[PDB]
Design a protein around this ligand. Structure first.
Ligand code: SF4
Ligand code: SF4
Ligand code: FES
Lengths: 230, 56
């Protein structure tokens, strides 16, 4: 009654038709490294990190794009899948500044956790590194666009859910700046969520700025007051 | 007497051969400030091509 039997590393799993490769892997317990995909946001194949090789295929498909059909043996720990993750990680960090001490995000950073586990130990890189002029977005959100990995997640956030339409890609190749072209002071509702949407230290809270690192502060669960929804 | 010539005969006489290898023994071949700045060699990595973590 609308269920497809497919294999993740040779293990049987039942899924609804229309679901993505990453959605099927979440059912068994697997988690493919990602940068664009979000549970609440839409689907885009920008970064091409969530590469997972399915057998009897010449090219490796992304976990974002492909919907699961009948009869697929998704191999997560094959020789080509490991080389795909190690490859793109080196491309992502070739044009990204050495800012981990001056970065507002510490242990929470998505680039840090993934590059240690999935990426290579050393980089081939010798010469390059692009530098991006920072744009003052608002007094609530500090913006250093040098660290941005042009993942296109905040642009989708402002367009589809926030519904403000200010952020956008301008330029081609290396010279691509994420943000408002007209230098407009972006202030609206849900603007304090775009700091949490961004996986890297490109967008961060200006009132918080620098106080503690993610690992240093002890987390405690509470319901927020002074709000109707709670 | 504090003269080394006569004393060296006494210490050699009283059980076992001495003369060489003193108690202090920090006179010659003790290099101060170690050496001129050296270059530390790299292992089987560092040199590019076929340096995948899939193999390692
Ligand atoms: S975004 Fe992550 S990897 Fe990049 S400088 Fe900040 S902490 Fe380091
Ligand atoms: S600012 Fe952050 S969320 Fe926006 S495109 Fe860059 S990395 Fe992605
Ligand atoms: S996370 Fe799937 S393409 Fe970027």
């Amino acid at each position: 009654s609308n269920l497809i039997e497919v294999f993740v590393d040779g293990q049987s799993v039942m899924v609804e038709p229309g679901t993505t490769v990453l959605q099927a892997c979440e059912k068994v317990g697997m988690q493919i490294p990602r940068f664009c995909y979000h549970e609440r946001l839409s689907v885009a194949g920008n970064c091409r990190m969530c590469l997972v090789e399915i057998e009897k295929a010449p090219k490796v498909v992304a976990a974002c794009a492909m919907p699961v059909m009948k009869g697929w043996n998704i191999l997560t720990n094959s020789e080509k899948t490991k080389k795909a993750r190690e490859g793109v990680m080196e491309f992502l960090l070739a044009n990204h500044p050495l800012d981990c001490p001056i970065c507002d995000q510490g242990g929470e950073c998505d680039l840090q956790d993934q590059s240690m586990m999935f990426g290579s130990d050393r980089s081939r890189f010798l010469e390059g590194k692009r530098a991006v002029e920072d744009k003052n977005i608002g007094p609530l959100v500090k913006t250093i666009m040098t660290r941005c990995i042009q993942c296109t997640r905040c642009i989708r956030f402002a367009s589809e859910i926030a519904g403000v339409d200010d952020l956008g890609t301008t330029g081609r190749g290396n010279d691509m700046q994420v943000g408002t072209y007209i230098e407009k002071m972006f202030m609206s509702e849900l603007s304090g969520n775009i700091i949490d949407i961004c996986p890297v230290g490109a967008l961060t809270s200006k009132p918080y700025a620098f106080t503690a690192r993610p690992w240093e502060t002890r987390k405690t669960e509470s319901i927020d007051v002074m709000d109707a929804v709670g | 007497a504090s003269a080394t010539r006569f004393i060296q005969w006494l210490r050699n006489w009283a059980s076992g051969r001495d003369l060489q290898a003193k108690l202090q023994l920090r006179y010659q071949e003790i290099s101060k400030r170690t050496q001129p700045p050296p270059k530390l060699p790299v292992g089987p990595s560092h040199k590019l091509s076929n340096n995948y973590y899939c193999t390692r």
